[PDB]
Every structure is written in structure tokens, then in C-alpha cells.
């Protein structure tokens, strides 16, 4: 006969049930291959068609085997990925790189997988942790040495983390989260370029800048901040700017007074480096 698969959307548990439907002694079987997290020890399992496992959000190759001879067909299950709006505290530094992510139950084995975006393909990195419990803050952690290029290059990385209490059982993996991160010294690299100040009215100016390099990496750029300094009163003002906007209007300026403007780009966890200061007057 002919069989077609169905899949649920990823649930809060990081699972989704692969179901089956028939639309055309004989034996029918299923071979299941988990593609994501390649550094895991066990990657395939042969199952009965009737038991419908709860997969993770990883990518899978599923193929139907029939025994009597038989026939074999395969469908590549796409990796549906949840988006965590809160960015993870990923710190790239002089001595190495460190991650923190929300942990769940105790004695959990985690697989961290990342690959640089838009060299679409390439350096696919995979990491498997020893079983570990949540810290008092409810977080798990792992670290790499400086030599380990773990997000050490100033590029956008796509990260996916999986969890299992029994990593040797293929059908027990769950998705934790997926996220984007810009590696290296993102605070310095994220500095906006081509900052310009233009006369908008007799008492207002338009400030424009090129989009930060962080804006190309989804969810990384939290906001822009524009700092304006009155060089006579020494008064300073900061204006947060939506990450989708690269322009802001400053009003209430006084004639003859010199002003200074700087722009920075902030992530959820890092203050950006200020741009070169702009000197101007009405």
C-alpha cells in the first residue's frame, strides 16, 4: 500500500509526535535516522510502524521498510525550530567561551550544535555534555577553551540545543531552544557606521546611521541608543530606538549651542561600543 506521514508542531516539551496514515503475511517497518547533533553515539533505530514516537525538533530521515521482499520510501522531516525571544547569556572572551541556558530536570545530557549562518553550510559544530543538574538559578552551562573557535569569529551563528535523560535512546530526544548569536567581540563589531546629522527644522535635527551588523542576526539587536550632549549646559540625553529604525529626530535645540551625538547598538546582554562622536550646531 501507500503510506504518508504527519507531524505535530513542536510542543512545550520540545517533542512532536510523528503519526502515520495509509492511502494506496506482509511485514511493514520504519527506519528512523536523526540528522541533527551528529556527535551523538546512536543515530538510527528501526521501529514498528504502529508505534508513533515523539520526535524532537531535529531533522530526521524516515523510511518505510516492508518484509514478505518489500519496498522502501523516504521523507526528510524538516527541523521545525522554536524561537526563544530572550537571548542566551553567551560570553566570548579572552580565555574561552561560555554558555548559559535554562535547565530542566536533573541528570540531563545536553547537545549544543551551532553552524555559521550564510556560509550556509560549512563549519557545523557539535557538542555533547556530561549529565548535569540545574544550578541554583535553574541554568545549565558549558565552556570551550579559547583555542576552540566556539563562535570566536565575528559572524552570525545559528544554535540549537537538545536534551535527553537517556541519550542512548534515539526516540527520547527533546528540543530545548534555538537561537541566533553574533560571535566574537560583538559589542565592538556592532558599532553603527555612517552616522550622519542633518538639519530637519530650526529647532530639530535628523540623526541617521547605517544598520548595525548585529541587525542581520535575528533577535540579537535589542535596540539602538542615541546619546546627545549639550556642550554648554553639559546636559546629556539618551533616546532608545527600535531595532527596525535607523533614524531619530532630536528636538528642542538652542541656537548657537554646540551638541554632540553618539550611537550604540545593544544586545540583550551587552552594551555596544559608542560610535565616533558627531559635532554639530543649528
Amino acid at each position: 500500500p501507500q503510506v504518508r506521514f504527519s507531524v505535530e508542531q513542536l510542543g512545550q516539551d520540545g517533542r512532536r509526535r510523528l503519526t502515520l496514515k495509509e492511502q494506496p503475511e506482509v511485514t511493514y517497518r520504519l527506519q528512523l535516522h536523526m540528522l541533527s547533533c551528529p556527535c551523538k553515539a546512536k543515530a538510527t533505530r528501526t521501529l514498528h510502524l504502529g508505534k508513533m514516537p515523539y520526535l524532537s525538533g531535529a531533522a530526521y530521515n524516515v523510511a518505510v521498510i516492508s518484509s514478505n521482499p518489500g519496498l522502501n520510501q523516504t521523507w526528510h522531516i524538516p527541523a521545525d525550530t522554536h524561537t526563544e525571544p530572550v537571548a542566551l547569556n553567551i560570553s566570548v572572551g579572552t580565555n574561552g567561551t561560555t554558555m548559559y541556558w535554562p535547565a530542566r530536570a536533573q541528570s540531563m545530557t545536553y547537545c549544543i550544535e551551532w553552524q555559521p549562518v550564510g556560509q550556509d553550510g560549512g563549519l557545523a559544530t557539535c557538542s555533547l555534555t556530561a549529565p548535569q543538574d540545574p544550578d541554583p538559578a535553574g541554568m545549565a552551562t558549558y565552556s570551550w577553551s579559547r583555542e576552540s573557535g566556539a563562535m570566536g569569529q565575528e559572524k552570525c551563528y545559528y544554535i540549537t540545543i537538545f536534551a535527553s535523560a537517556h541519550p542512548e535512546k534515539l526516540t527520547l530526544w527533546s528540543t530545548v531552544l534555538s537561537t541566533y548569536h553574533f560571535g566574537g567581540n560583538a559589542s565592538a563589531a556592532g558599532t553603527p557606521h555612517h552616522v550622519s546629522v542633518k538639519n530637519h527644522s530650526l529647532d530639530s535635527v535628523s540623526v541617521d546611521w547605517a544598520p548595525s551588523l548585529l541587525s542581520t542576526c535575528p533577535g540579537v539587536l535589542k535596540e539602538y541608543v542615541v546619546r546627545c550632549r549639550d556642550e554648554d549646559s553639559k546636559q546629556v540625553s539618551e533616546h532608545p530606538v527600535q531595532p527596525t529604525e535607523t533614524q531619530v529626530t532630536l528636538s528642542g535645540l538652542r541656537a548657537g549651542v554646540a551638541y554632540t551625538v553618539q550611537v550604540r547598538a545593544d544586545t540583550a546582554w551587552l552594551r555596544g561600543v559608542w560610535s565616533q562622536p558627531q559635532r554639530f550646531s543649528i
Epitope: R15, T27, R29, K42, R45, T46, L47, H48, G50, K51, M52, P53, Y54, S67, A105, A165, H166, E168, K169, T171, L172
Partner: antibody, heavy 120, light 107 residues
Framework: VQLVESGGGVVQPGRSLRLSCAAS????????MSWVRQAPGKGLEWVAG????????EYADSVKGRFTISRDNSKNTLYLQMNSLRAEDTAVYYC??????????????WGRGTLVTVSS | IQMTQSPSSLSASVGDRVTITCRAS??????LAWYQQKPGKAPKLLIY???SLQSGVPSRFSGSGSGTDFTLTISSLQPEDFATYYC?????????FGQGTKVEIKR
């Protein structure tokens, strides 16, 4: 992790008896459960199983129409309703845990077991 | 699915290398488990997925095989290993056990 069976004893043939298993030490709602019985001088026989959300239930052929497995996830209790009991059902009944959502793989935790004697 | 173990019983001494076989009436790939039971006690899971060792089990235990023929192996028999051993398929419902193999002490 502990599993405690209760409700066993003597029961006349054709009558009914309800077994209960109390679970503790883990998240009861996240694991499938099963019952396994063992006649005194005999080997092991899998009786019934149920998934984590009680959506999947399976029974052995020798008990299909006669037994009923169920779970109360709010009270961490597994149940086995036995009706129309025969003498062959006389066995020690264990409750055991499955490591996944679905009824799958081996049984990593077992209870003490309770004796059920079916006789008049 | 019928699960046939061989032999039904065997006698061995401490230190011996023990091998039990398990045979399935139908092909079950790797969905097989092994259990150990002592008189008057609940069974204990030793090996799953035909060859994965369960946590806490000593390294002297090992399993292998696929399809219809499976083997359980104890490299060096220890005094606490004398018991009865059962294989079980979970390839499909209803789950079925083998008849058991009793490992006794030879004298």
C-alpha cells in the same frame, strides 16, 4: 523512586478486583506505565500498558476484554481493574515504569508486587 | 511473537564465561531487553537496545545481536550473578518475555 502495589488478596472466580500502584520519587505524568504478572512457579507475563497521557493503552490477548488499565496523573496512581477473573490469573502482579512518553523499551523501575489468588 | 531462550538452565562456577541465547519467532531488529531476577524479588533491567548497558550494571555484562538471534554474555561470573535471566521484545505489542534461563552454581 518507589512503586507500591496494593489491593491483592483472595477473590472468587468470575468476580472483580481492583489493583492500585502508588508512585513516588519522580514526575509521574511523564512516563508510561505497565503491569507485569508472574504465576508462582512460572515466568513473567506482560499484562497491560498505558502511555503518559493515557491516550495509548495495550493489553495482552489473554486479558483483553477482561482487564482495564487506567491512571490518575493528579494523584500519581496507576490502576488495573480486573473483571471475570479465572484461576489462571492467580499470580503476583508488579507495577513497572516505562522510560518514555509512549509504551516502549524496557522497564527500569519495579514495585514490590502483590499476590492475587483466584479460587472459591 | 514467541521468545525462546536457550538453554533453560546451566551450571557454572565463579569466574566462568557464561553465554545465554535468545531467539525470536519474528524479526525484531534491536528492540530487545534483558532482565535478572532473584527468588522472591522483582526483576532488574540489565541491557536495552540489544547492546546498551543499563546504568549501575557492572561491565562484565554485555549483549549483542539483531533481527532474530540475540546473545547475553557474562565475562566473569560473580557470586551475586547466580539467578534467573529473561529476555523481552518490545518491537511490538503485546510485549512478550522469554521462558527464562536459570544460572546455577556447579559443584
Amino acid at each position: 523512586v518507589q512503586l507500591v502495589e496494593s489491593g491483592g488478596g483472595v477473590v472468587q472466580p468470575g468476580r472483580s478486583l481492583r489493583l492500585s500502584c502508588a508512585a513516588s520519587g519522580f514526575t509521574f505524568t511523564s512516563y508510561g506505565m505497565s503491569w507485569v504478572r508472574q504465576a508462582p512457579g512460572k515466568g513473567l507475563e506482560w499484562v497491560a500498558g498505558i502511555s503518559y497521557d493515557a491516550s495509548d493503552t495495550e493489553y495482552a490477548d489473554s486479558v483483553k476484554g477482561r482487564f482495564t488499565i487506567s491512571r490518575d496523573n493528579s494523584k500519581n496512581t496507576l490502576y488495573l481493574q480486573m473483571n471475570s477473573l479465572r484461576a489462571e490469573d492467580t499470580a503476583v502482579y508488579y507495577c513497572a515504569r516505562s522510560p518514555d512518553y509512549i509504551i516502549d523499551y524496557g522497564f527500569d523501575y519495579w514495585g514490590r508486587g502483590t499476590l492475587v489468588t483466584v479460587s472459591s | 511473537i514467541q521468545m525462546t531462550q536457550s538453554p533453560s538452565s546451566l551450571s557454572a562456577s565463579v569466574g566462568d564465561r557464561v553465554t545465554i541465547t535468545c531467539r525470536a519467532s519474528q524479526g525484531i531488529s534491536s528492540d530487545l531487553a534483558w532482565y535478572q531476577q532473584k527468588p522472591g524479588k522483582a526483576p532488574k533491567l540489565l541491557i536495552y537496545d540489544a547492546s546498551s548497558l543499563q546504568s549501575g550494571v557492572p561491565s562484565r555484562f554485555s549483549g549483542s545481536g539483531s533481527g532474530t538471534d540475540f546473545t547475553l554474555t557474562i565475562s566473569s561470573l560473580q557470586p551475586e550473578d547466580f539467578a534467573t535471566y529473561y529476555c523481552q521484545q518490545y518491537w511490538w505489542y503485546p510485549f512478550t518475555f522469554g521462558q527464562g534461563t536459570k544460572v546455577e552454581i556447579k559443584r
